[PDB]
């Protein structure tokens, strides 16, 4: 099992610093060139830095030269990316990748560079408009509003209610994220059986459980 595991991704203010790590296993690390490749929120992939197996040779695109420094500790099976004087343009998912043109990629670690402040979400329940309606199925929801940074985690009934759910991508409206999640159940099972959405926002160290009750 050849593995690359990234870590060290966080929220940084513009002008701030961050060091990412990439732990490798399943191969002789010093034998392979390594790169960092970022994926932007628009999902463009961008090659960011490369280093030789032996550590002696490095390259960078001009857009990161003098800001980012790639290194490796072969004795530790670790690749590093030291990022400094960060701007919002650097906000991305940062992948660690191995040269054969990258045949092995890590899962990535998220970096976000922003002057916007860490903010817990407000969680609002979405119960059907007061009129009792109607068919076999009832759609309920939770509205998760005004948090920063990403991500949030949304579950239903602690994860035991997994079928029939749509959790939508967050949208950024002036410094803050809003997301919603829908769940559809047999109309016979609600409100007789409780439906609760659980929202976690690790950045703010917050969890909120919001039981969906019929409105009056």
């Amino acid at each position: 099992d050849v593995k690359l595991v990234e870590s060290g991704g966080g929220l940084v203010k513009p002008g701030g610093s961050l060091r990412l790590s990439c732990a490798a296993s399943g191969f002789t690390f010093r034998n392979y060139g390594m790169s960092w490749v970022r994926q932007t929120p628009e999902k463009r992939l961008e090659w960011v830095a490369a280093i030789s197996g032996n550590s002696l040779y490095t390259s960078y695109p001009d857009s990161v030269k003098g800001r980012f420094t790639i290194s490796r500790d072969n004795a530790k099976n670790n690749l590093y990316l030291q990022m400094s004087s960060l701007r919002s343009e650097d906000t991305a998912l940062y992948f660690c990748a191995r040269h054969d043109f990258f045949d092995v990629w890590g899962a990535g670690t998220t970096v976000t560079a922003s002057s916007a402040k860490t903010t817990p979400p407000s969680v609002y329940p979405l119960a059907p408009g007061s009129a009792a309606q109607t068919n076999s199925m009832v759609t309920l929801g939770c509205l998760v509003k005004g948090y920063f940074p990403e991500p949030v985690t949304v579950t239903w009934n602690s994860g035991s209610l997994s079928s029939g759910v749509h959790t939508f991508p967050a949208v950024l409206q002036s410094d803050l994220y809003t997301l919603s999640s829908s769940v559809t159940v047999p109309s016979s099972t609600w409100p007789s059986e409780t439906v609760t959405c659980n929202v976690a926002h690790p950045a703010s160290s917050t969890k909120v459980d919001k039981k969906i009750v019929p409105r009056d």
Partner: protein
């Protein structure tokens, strides 16, 4: 920099049919050793990219015979003969011939299915959001096909395009449908000045406009 341009941006295909994706480069990617390091990656949502083709035409270990690469000059093609569900995701071309190494912008490979009308649900602002001075009206248009659907909001019968945020899920793996969320955010005062709130689902030729309404009272 070699700019890599992919077309199309998105490609709906019926399972078991052929797909071909093009990648153009702004300049030669023949490396000085005579070789062309054109690669294709597949990225599935939730996952990291996976190598499928290297050096224009060589299938990476484990990659099925249905994937092939062609090309030479500034134009390169990935063909998938007979697409399966496991093949769906975003395809990226990549040149490793000249530093900086560069990626194409990606091509989204999607499955075709029968057209499906959305299930539409409208929600008033919760009482909890009102105590804080806000008012969002939420509309879910769930499990529809194709991806492009028109959502229209009306307030007391008058169209509102301004305070609305839409968000779309990735094509559902099990049923191949899309779902969408539409949010109309208003102040509490603005909300309390109006009565009928309506969320409307249409195509542009679809003779079935699905309307969902509430009156705040």
């Amino acid at each position: 920099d070699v700019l890599m341009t992919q077309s199309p941006l998105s490609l709906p295909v019926s399972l078991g049919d052929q797909a071909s994706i093009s990648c153009r480069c702004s300049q030669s990617i023949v490396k000085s050793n005579g070789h062309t390091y054109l690669e294709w990656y597949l990225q599935k949502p939730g996952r990291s990219p996976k190598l499928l083709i290297y050096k224009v035409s060589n299938r990476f270990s484990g990659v099925p015979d249905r994937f092939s690469g062609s090309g030479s000059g500034t134009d390169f093609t990935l063909r998938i003969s007979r697409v399966e569900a496991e093949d769906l995701g975003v395809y990226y071309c990549f040149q490793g011939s000249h530093i900086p190494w560069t990626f194409g912008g990606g091509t989204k490979l999607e499955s075709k299915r029968a057209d499906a009308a959305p299930t539409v649900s409208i929600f008033p602002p919760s009482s909890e959001q009102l105590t804080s001075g806000g008012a969002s009206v939420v509309c879910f248009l769930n499990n529809f096909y194709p991806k492009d659907i028109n959502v229209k909001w009306k307030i007391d019968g008058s169209e509102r395009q301004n305070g609305v945020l839409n968000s779309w899920t990735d094509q559902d793996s099990k049923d191949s449908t899309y779902s969408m969320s539409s949010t109309l955010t208003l102040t509490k005062d603005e909300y309390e000045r109006h009565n009928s709130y309506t969320c409307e689902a249409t195509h542009k030729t679809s003779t079935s406009p699905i309307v969902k309404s509430f009156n705040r009272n």
